[PDB]
């Protein structure tokens, strides 16, 4: 490795993405971890760990379809509109993106947004639970798993991913480039011009490779491991199709406490 015009351009690209990342996403990883580790003494979230504490935190939970699960997915997708818009604003700042065909821009984003939402959801997660209600609440992992089928299986694979993803200890500077690589995935179905997408991603990959060397001396194969997390992100998205079928094939009672339904609308 040398400091030359090529490497300097890769550092300038990393700074450009990071600055645009800060402008687009007010909920950074640093802010999330500060709440999880109990740093922010002003916003101390309330812990919801069982049905009793669920009722104790009724005030902190702020409020169509027939089935409970479908209304949850409709609600959480509606509450994810702002995040989708933020991701789209971020993609505009990726050099070369807005010059692609508009249909390919839409295709890249319509698949990319789900994976990026899961990436940022991991920031709100530790091994014990997940932040909800805009940092005002903390829903424990085991309480979610204990809920009746099929709800008890909704979030646990995302926790399993988040714990391993968070163990890589990426910061917001890393995540800015990693998210850009996700967006510029040339293997999305329906893409028209794959080559100009791959040309951009190859440059983003080079910037990511250099960023991880400079920022993470403790992990020599971090670049490989981080690209492997793409496969975990896509698997979680594909598991949503199986989830809808489990919901349709469920004959047992799928009634859920209204406060629990509102909490699931804050997840994904």
């Amino acid at each position: 490795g040398q400091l030359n015009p090529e490497s300097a351009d890769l550092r300038a690209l990393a700074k450009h993405l990071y600055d645009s990342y800060i402008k687009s996403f007010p909920l950074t990883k640093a802010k999330a971890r500060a709440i999880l580790t109990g740093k922010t003494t002003d916003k101390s979230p309330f812990v919801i760990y069982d049905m009793n504490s669920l009722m104790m935190g009724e005030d902190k939970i702020k409020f169509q379809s027939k089935e409970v699960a479908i209304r949850i997915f409709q609600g959480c997708q509606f509450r994810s509109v702002e995040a989708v818009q933020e991701i789209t604003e971020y993609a505009k700042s990726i050099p070369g993106f807005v010059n692609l065909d508009l249909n390919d821009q839409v295709t890249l984003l319509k698949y990319g947004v789900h994976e990026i939402i899961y990436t940022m959801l991991a920031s709100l997660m530790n091994k014990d639970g997940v932040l909800i209600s805009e940092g005002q609440g903390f829903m424990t992992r085991e309480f979610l798993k204990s809920l009746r089928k099929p709800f008890g299986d909704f979030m646990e694979p995302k926790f399993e991913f988040a714990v391993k993803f968070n163990a890589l200890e990426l910061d917001d500077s890393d995540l800015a480039i990693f998210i850009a690589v996700i967006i510029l995935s040339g293997d999305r179905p329906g893409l028209l011009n794959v080559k100009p997408i791959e040309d951009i991603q190859d440059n983003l990959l080079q910037a990511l490779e250099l960023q991880l060397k400079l920022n993470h001396p403790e992990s020599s194969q971090l670049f490989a491991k981080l690209l492997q997390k793409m496969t975990d992100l896509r698997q979680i998205v594909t598991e949503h199709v199986q989830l809808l079928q489990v919901i349709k094939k469920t004959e047992t009672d799928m009634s859920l406490h209204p406060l629990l339904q509102e909490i699931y609308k804050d997840l994904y």
Binding site: Q77, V84, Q85, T88, K92, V106, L109, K110, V113
Partner: peptide, 14 residues
Amino acid sequence: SNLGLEDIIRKALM
């Protein structure tokens, strides 16, 4: 929704 998400993305790209 797939077409509902595309509409949100297309409008956001404007």
